[model samples]
Target chain A: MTNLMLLPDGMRRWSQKQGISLDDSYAAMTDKLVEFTGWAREEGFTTFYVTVSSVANYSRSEEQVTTAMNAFTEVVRRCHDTLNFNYSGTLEVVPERWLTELEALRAKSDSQSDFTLHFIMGMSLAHEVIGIFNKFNGKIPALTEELLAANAYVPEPVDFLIRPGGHVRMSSFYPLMSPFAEMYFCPTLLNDMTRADFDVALEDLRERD
Target chain B: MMTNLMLLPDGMRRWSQKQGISLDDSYAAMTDKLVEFTGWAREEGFTTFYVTVSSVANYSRSEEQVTTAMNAFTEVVRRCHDTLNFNYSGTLEVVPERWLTELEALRAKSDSQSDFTLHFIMGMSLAHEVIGIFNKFNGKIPALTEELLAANAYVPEPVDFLIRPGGHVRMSSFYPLMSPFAEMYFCPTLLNDMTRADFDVALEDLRERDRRYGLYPV
Candidate 1:
């Protein structure tokens, strides 16, 4: 089982409240986050997933891009052994051959150790949310013209499928998007039967259940 | 046609008095001399000689050799432009072949405007004296022996030089060893008439002039 922790949005809100030049202060604070991760890694966490995307007004300029690259490169230089990055970014203008772009990321992800490779397609603001989640093989049980065979508290799954920054709220369904893909890490044992058993179950929960 | 300054024994004495180490201390002061040469070079003076080697003592070791290499490397690095370095050590032992060997100093000295380079050689001890001076040849011309006779009062060319604790020294040969080379440098326009082939004639005279401090080359 994976423990999920949501970073209280207070960090970004406080950074905005400080009201110094947002680019410089936000970058400096982000650098501190990278430092914390580096120190945590040295203290012996097996794997780490650090947030590094610019979805909002605070982190989407040339300055932020350079600052993020430098900060991330520094963190990796300091703690390459224990860290993994989950990257997310928009495709700016949609590519002519979308499959080619997806295939490239797939190839890159396959080439690296699975625990260290991750991508979130959160920036596809125009795509249908349920379709995107289905493409990555998320399991939501069922939908439908009638209620479930028994008790039904769940809204129609379509109601939860709102585009990224739209009138309808999608803030709730993100936790369910990847199903059981994340769980425990066994550092020294490659393909240990115990870990493999749990991971196979996790994949089943992700893909078919 | 060249000026030779006889500052060896006196300079050695002054340096030892100031640093209070040993003959080795006298060598260390010449690092300061190298620094002085760097400034003098910037002013574009064509003919100036700064003595860089230090008098060696009875106890010198491999560590000293490497330390000096590192020190010299740092000195060259601190300078304004790029430099190429060449060094010579006793070859009976294995060491890397450097660009500016002791004998190739002459080439760097007369390189004029085409390609400027820096050459350094280690005359590790006094026994290497004549060999060190022999390195100062530019394929020919006004040799060190003539330059000294023209410039200094006491010119008894010593076969092997001495660094006396205190004494009246007649000749500081390296000053002469460097002067003709300096003349070629300080006055490059006159080099077309300056016969470059007479360098060995000067070496022959270097032997006959002074054999007081040590025996002649066997």
Candidate 2:
């Protein structure tokens, strides 16, 4: 049976009267992923495509882009802990300053992992992505090669940053963000990713020197 | 029950449309004096009120001014006709150019009583009234001066010589020939008795003579 919650005096009055607790009938409904995975296994769907969508893009000017990226990262972290799933994801570090930091972290031994870091190029963020890739010294081999490849493809007649398919994917799921003010960022490059993809992408990369 | 008519298509359209005739039903209505007076009175009311109520006069361009005037006139005519009650009465006398010859013949009594000699001023066949007035002219006590004033006072100002209320009565009512097309005949100073209050000024003033003479006197 479905239970309905009503605030006769609206949100503020109802919250005050209800004590805002969830220990009893008011508690949020959550279940262990074990049941869901079990059900999926029984249903014969083996490969789970865990999407780890992030919006930490540099070229993006919309301020909500940062908050969305942080929220998306938080949600992914929680899911990783709750469910035993590999996260193979691509993080497009936008803006020159952020990309530089991301590159430095990417080169460190501990930070070099399974995920593939693809640069989401074009627009203002593309300029920053290039600066980070070239300036950060003593790079991880995989990241360094990818950075070199990005640089190599720069158009001779004009400067065109090379961005991979994973990074440069069209923002298909942004329409869902219109519901709330939190995710209601402007129409720009934002992504939704599956967890398995995130882990596999990280483990597959090379040269964390 | 009154029938309306117009000598020109523009005037006809203005009337038939104003009287709620459908777009397709124009020109069927012929001009009867009753209908002309009815429509003209209604037009006067519309023009007078809007010219008072709105900011149309302040508009700069001539086209805008004419459009606003036309709309206001039509509206007033429509409202008064629909709401108020009055007799829409009128008459017209047409004269041939050679009125002098006809009048001279009448003075000589060469024609019998039924002779249709047209009087230029009355534009009639000197009808019943003018013939009586003509016989009494200056011979004995011609009508009393006050009687003459009373007779002429209510005479409807010709439509061709329309005048507004505010302007100098005589000068303003004069068919305003001040525009580029000075030679062309236009509406008159009297504007068919629709002009109010200051009729004497326009009639007596020497300056308004141009307007007085410009009209066809219909």
Candidate 3:
């Protein structure tokens, strides 16, 4: 069963290309993820992991960061009551308002269970690695490969990544969770990508070992 | 100015199959390219490089193939000695640390440091690197900090650019802790299917990203 990971880059440029408002572009990508999540679950994909913002994006301008945070908050507001949403990421960088909102949203979601759908925003793997060690209130296990995987935010090692940004690298998007994941890069901008675009990457991944 | 250029060398077996050459010969061509690329990258203003001599995944292959890659690695250190500083990563499960210790011995023959240094991540994967770090500090995790982990890990510095040439788009978990905010240029060039002209494109791509930190276009 493939656990699909999505890291969408070039958000501002994507907004510029589509001539859509930046807010709409972010919403389109979010909606596409919700669209794909339903499709993948039926297709037997075990998990759907998406990153709206990475620590790399935390370096973006204040206006850009606000736009990303608002989009994230809106998504959580809708889906939090009924998703097996696994959560992870650093909190020191998030604004106080977003923090309160995330805690409120997580409260609604942590009450249910199913196939996992994780969203990693404002995260850094370097710190996440450090955070894993500090788990269990200082009773973290002796730590085998499996022990570490047990503590990971994303449930399993990512089997496939559909990154739309022309750029090839993971850009540090959940690398620890997706070490051996096959990468499928779409040069077409994020909002410009469609299900056909995703299917092409999916087909290629199905063919890979 | 690439702060670091990481090279994950693969495609030799594929190159061998396509080129109709012996695997030994294919790996030989890769070693020669490594020596050649080292000189040119230094001239192109790269002072640091992280090259995978053999990842942990390579160990599960047939012994013949494994030995062939190690043989190729031996020549890379020998030939690049004139203008390269060789360092080591991973636990050295198979190739052993003595080979890297010899790079320093080889360096004593020179009166000055080379403009380029290679951190040869020998015989391990990112999983192995991380597990080893965890084992090293098993009782010490309660005191561990992010800075401590970053500074003390197998890979010791922040990376600027990773040049992956196997047509593989992702880094495959290649030292992400050390490469928190790095960029990459994934060229379709194979391991032995290399050229100076094709290699120069990676340097050109690296030169194109802005100097600003948050401008990576994520």
**Top candidate, metric TM-score:** 3
Runs in model 3 with CA error above 4 Å?
A: A18-21, A59-63, A80-82, A103-114, A136-141, B97-112, B173-175, B210-218
lDDT of 3 by residue, A51-134 (tens): 666666777778777788887677667666667655667666677787788777777674545566777766667766666666
Candidate achieving the largest lDDT? 3
Q: Please give the lDDT score at residue A195 for candidate 1.
A: 31
What is the C-alpha lDDT profile of model 1 across B1-218, one tens digit per residue?
22221112224434456557664555445444445444443333222322223233211446665455435433442442233222222211222234233233434434345222333323222123322222323223233343432232112221121111122211221222212111111111111122223322332333333221111122
TM-scores, in order shown?
0.23, 0.17, 0.87
Residues B98-194 of candidate 2 have per-residue lDDT tens digits of 3323333333443234212111112111112222232333234323243342233212221222223221111111221111111111232322222
Compute DockQ for each candidate against the true complex.
0.00, 0.00, 0.52
The regions of model 1 sitting more than 4 angstroms off are A1-19, A39-47, A54-173, A178-209, B1-218
For the record, the alpha-carbon RMSD of candidate 1 to the native fold, in angstroms, is: 34.0
lDDT of 3 at A25: 79
* Most accurate candidate by DockQ: 3
